[PDB]
């Protein structure tokens, strides 16, 4: 991209970044503009007379390169960029920082046969890396690593307790637990940002399945009450109080 042949690609990407401020911030429009810019620069990678010797994988890496460069420039205008996203973030953080203190795997229907004794610590850590990166791809990869780790740990539990292979019934409740224990900062904005700004052609297949899992995990967690984690209403509220005092 620094090579003198790419001069006019560089000018084009930069007149986009400058031309982005020319509109009052608006997520739905903003992300529509970025996806179209991505759609178009990516059309200009493959079709370009100079880039017609590139492999599929290389063109795909350049896409992610563009994504990363652009999104790092746009980051503070597009990410958690208004009051309602800020508010949803804080509500999620608040609830997890409380509930993580008393939640147990049986509250979520995790059977003892699928227990991990690290409490899937490595998956928690993979998820918490999410605010170490700015590109949607690298943020998503944290989610996806977390998911893979959970799955490998569930598979190990099933081997050991001679159970059948884990599916959504085993996985989702463990993703929820892990997410609560990880309490990753700005989880709501992080997911919205991935959904909006990730190269749309790439939010597909297994990637999109596990993404949908974490979005449904976020939704469950937002709405956690006594009944949703099978506790008595008096037991629930009293657990919340003691959590606030710590």
């Amino acid at each position: 991209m620094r090579k003198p042949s790419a001069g006019d690609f560089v000018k084009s990407i930069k007149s986009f970044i400058v031309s982005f401020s020319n509109n009052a911030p608006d997520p739905e429009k903003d992300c529509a503009m970025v996806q179209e810019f991505f759609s178009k620069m990516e059309a200009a990678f493959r079709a370009h007379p100079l880039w017609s010797g590139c492999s599929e994988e290389e063109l795909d890496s350049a896409g992610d390169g563009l994504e990363k460069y652009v999104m790092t420039k746009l980051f503070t205008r597009v990410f958690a960029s208004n009051t309602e996203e800020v508010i949803a973030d804080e509500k999620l953080f608040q609830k997890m920082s409380l509930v993580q203190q008393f939640i147990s795997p049986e509250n979520l229907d995790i059977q003892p046969t699928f227990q991990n004794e690290s409490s899937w610590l490595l998956a928690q850590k993979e998820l918490q890396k999410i605010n170490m990166y700015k590109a949607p791809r690298d943020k998503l990869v944290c989610i996806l690593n977390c998911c893979k780790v959970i799955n490998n740990l569930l598979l190990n539990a099933s081997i050991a307790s001679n159970e059948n292979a884990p599916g959504a019934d085993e996985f989702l409740p463990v993703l929820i637990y892990v997410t609560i224990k990880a309490n990753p900062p700005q989880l709501h904005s992080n997911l919205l940002y991935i959904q909006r700004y990730r190269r749309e052609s790439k939010l597909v297949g297994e990637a999109a399945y596990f993404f949908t899992n974490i979005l449904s995990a976020e939704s469950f967690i937002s709405n956690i009450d006594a009944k949703s984690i099978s506790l008595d209403e008096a037991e629930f509220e009293k657990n919340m109080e003691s959590a606030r005092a710590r």
Partner: protein, 165 residues
């Protein structure tokens, strides 16, 4: 080149995972040992000199996660609602999934009702009659399946691929 998103709905223990693994890997835990999880799969099938590629989405069946399901079955071209023929409560639950997809899923969705664990004899509690009747009244087809013995596993996926609008 017909790409289908297919959701598997039903409560825990019904056999959603066992079914899809039989279909994909041709294994059942008792005969082959466990290799991979069963929450997501791609599978291609040949239908009438064409090609149909299934993206298969497992869902959590527990009651506490019920209200999460629409996020999974959104835009599904097909659904298998599974119940355990030996559990009357699983059958009741499967009918609610059907009702919901009819209120709130795609009208051109191919739903299949799978009556799993057919191989279990002294345990069975749900009749072919009720399942068959129910499915006949509600615009879907019923098949009896078994992950263990492989009965009607390939066929239910074939029959879903066949019916694709």
């Amino acid at each position: 080149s017909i790409n289908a998103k297919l959701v598997l709905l039903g409560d825990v223990g019904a056999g959603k995972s066992s079914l899809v693994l039989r279909f994909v890997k041709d294994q059942f835990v008792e005969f082959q040992e466990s290799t991979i999880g069963a929450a997501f799969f791609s599978q291609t099938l040949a239908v009438n000199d064409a090609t149909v590629k299934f993206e298969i989405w497992d869902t959590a069946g527990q009651e506490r996660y019920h209200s999460l399901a629409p996020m999974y079955y959104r835009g599904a071209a097909a659904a298998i609602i599974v119940f355990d023929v030996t559990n009357q409560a699983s059958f009741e639950r499967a009918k609610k999934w059907v009702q919901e997809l009819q209120a709130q899923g795609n009208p051109n969705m191919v739903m299949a009702l799978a009556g799993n664990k057919s191989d279990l004899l002294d345990a069975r509690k749900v009749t072919a009659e009720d399942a068959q009747t129910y499915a006949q009244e509600n615009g879907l087809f019923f098949m009896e399946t078994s992950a263990k013995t492989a009965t009607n596993v390939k066929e239910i996926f074939y029959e879903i691929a066949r019916r694709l609008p």
